Design a protein around this ligand. Structure first.
Ligand code: FOF
Lengths: 30, 29, 30, 29, 30, 30
């Protein structure tokens, strides 16, 4: 349903955010 | 419903946040 | 209910966070 | 219930995160 | 339940995230 | 169900995010 759909959206965005933050963390080493 | 509306609202900001962090990740390379 | 109330709070905070990250992204371009 | 309790904690933490990100934005100006 | 269990994990993670961002904010002052 | 699955994904992502932010905080000290 709508809630599930949004949660999948939220889950996809958090995966992207995690990836970007991993990238940032790697850059600041360095 | 309200939860659903809030969840759509929640999903949009996280897209903005994801984009900004992509930009930030790009600047820092 | 409490859950809805909390979700509206959560939504508001995420808007503040998104805004701050836009600012941060801008500063780091220079 | 437990879900409601957790969401309140989540809201509280997001307020803290928001405050910190404002401080971070100020520093980078 | 499974949902409640996940929310506690999420709540725990957000506390850690808040803590880390506070440390980051402090470091960026000087 | 799907909601629980998404929340597990969300919980997993926030753990990653928390971890990356610790790395970033450590780096800014340093
Ligand atoms: C509202 C529920 C079910 C999950 C929301 C999780 C969430 C709002 C995480 C935000 C993490 C964040 C924006 C970090 C920014 O550095």
């Amino acid at each position: 349903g709508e809630i599930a759909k949004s949660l999948k959206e939220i889950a996809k965005s958090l995966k992207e955010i995690a990836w970007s933050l991993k990238e940032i963390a790697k850059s600041l080493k360095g």
